[PDB]
């Protein structure tokens, strides 16, 4: 297998079982010696997968309204950058059907239901498919692997029927998630120093790459 | 590896150590030539040297710091005080010698050198030797005080 900044310590426990494994661990955070707390290989892999999925949802979301505004498809009052949509009211605010602090409570409650069920399945595998939940517990039984639950709810189309195809698709998921985390960090620090949306930043770079660049922005 | 500090005479069970301060050749030579360590000489002659050296010194502090230092009687008063102190010290030496030593007994000084050679024990550790030492010390101390006073206040030497 290809290797990327591997070391003698890191290769002693990264044997290639995990998807998207290249032996990269300079700090040895996943060393199985004395695992405890939140520093644990299984928890670290699960966290990487979940963060990748959430960043992949966020990376396209923070730019989808902006490009359609410059394309003249959505009204200009909704083509706001991600930092002037109500996330940071000091930077700007938009008036929705409810005040922002009210929406926060509803989001908190729904996300609490979903995430508490996910955590309780992580703690006790197969526990969420036992107690009566509106008759939806029949499909929320999980599969024994916390990161890949499958089932009629989380695998509707039935992709990845073959195990080799499943491994390839897991590798693709990991790669795309890592790329999306990088893009999200780029979003944050681009917004910090240029003070304008990432799509406009890309258009600025395309217009003139030498006058509109880091050497001229910082 | 070279080590400087060694046990005393090579015996590690005697309560002392040998250091450059104690066993340097210059320090060893200097101490062996002082009158108090010349075990083969008449105690009277060592006492005379010790008395001369000690009496000569005592004049200075008494003269310079005394209650009459700022008056015309500074030198005479200082010399008289030094002579009185010499007399007191002579009395102390006589009393110590009477108390410690008994007539007719042999000397109690060690008779072994550091190299193991046998030597005649010092006669200063006997009644007669200590009496001679005290009588030499008194005569030496008076002579030294008188010499210091004479040099300082009979000859107008350019001192200070």
């Amino acid at each position: 297998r290809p290797l990327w900044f591997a070391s003698s310590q890191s290769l002693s426990y990264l044997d290639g079982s995990l998807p998207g494994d290249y032996g990269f661990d300079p700090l040895g955070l996943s060393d199985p010696e004395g695992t405890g707390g939140f520093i644990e290989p299984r928890w670290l892999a699960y966290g990487e997968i979940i963060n990748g999925r959430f960043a992949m949802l966020g990376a396209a979301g923070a730019i989808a309204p902006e490009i359609l505004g410059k394309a003249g498809l959505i009204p200009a009052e909704t083509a706001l950058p991600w930092f002037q949509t109500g996330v940071i009211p000091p930077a700007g605010t938009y008036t929705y059907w409810a005040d922002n602090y009210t929406l926060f409570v509803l989001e908190m409650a729904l996300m609490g239901f979903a995430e508490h069920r996910r955590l309780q399945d992580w703690y006790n595998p197969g526990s969420m498919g036992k107690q009566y939940f509106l008759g939806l517990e029949k499909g929320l039984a999980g599969s024994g692997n916390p990161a890949y639950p499958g089932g009629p709810f989380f695998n509707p189309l039935g992709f990845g029927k073959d195990e080799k195809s499943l491994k390839e698709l897991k590798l693709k998921e990991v790669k795309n998630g890592r790329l999306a985390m990088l893009a999200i960090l780029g979003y944050f620090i681009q917004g910090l120093v240029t003070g304008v949306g990432p799509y406009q930043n890309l258009l600025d770079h395309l217009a003139d790459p030498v006058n509109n660049n880091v050497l001229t922005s910082l | 590896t070279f080590q400087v500090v060694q046990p005393i005479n090579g015996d590690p069970f005697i309560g002392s150590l040998e250091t450059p301060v104690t066993s340097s050749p210059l320090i060893a030579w200097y101490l062996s030539n002082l009158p108090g360590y010349r075990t083969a000489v008449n105690p009277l002659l060592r006492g005379v040297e010790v008395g001369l050296a000690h009496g000569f010194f005592l004049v200075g502090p008494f003269v310079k710091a005394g209650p009459l230092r700022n008056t015309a009687y500074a030198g005479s008063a200082g010399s008289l005080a030094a002579a009185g102190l010499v007399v007191i010290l002579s009395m102390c030496l006589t009393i110590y010698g009477i108390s410690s030593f008994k007539e007719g007994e042999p000397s109690i000084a060690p008779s072994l050198t550091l190299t193991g050679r046998k030597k005649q024990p010092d006669q200063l550790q006997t009644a007669d030797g200590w009496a001679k030492f005290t009588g030499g010390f008194f005569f030496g101390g008076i002579s030294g005080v008188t010499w210091a006073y004479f040099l300082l206040y009979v000859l107008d030497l350019p001192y200070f």
Binding site: L3, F5, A6, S7, S8, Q9 | -
Partner: protein, 84 residues
Amino acid sequence: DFIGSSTNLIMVTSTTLMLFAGRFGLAPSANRKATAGLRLEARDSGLQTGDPAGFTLADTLACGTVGHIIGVGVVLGLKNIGAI
């Protein structure tokens, strides 16, 4: 111009000189330890580097930092007395 200025030249020279000394055995490294007599003894670090001489990323960062420190000191010292 800043690019042709004396500060640019001094700093580049210092950094390149320190990196050269670290790579070609003229300074201590992850693979070379100075003893009490200032003699380099061979060491194995356990770090894969993909370099013929064994020169690691940690060697590179350290040598760059030392070169930058020396260059900054020299530049400021010369600037103080009016030489540059």
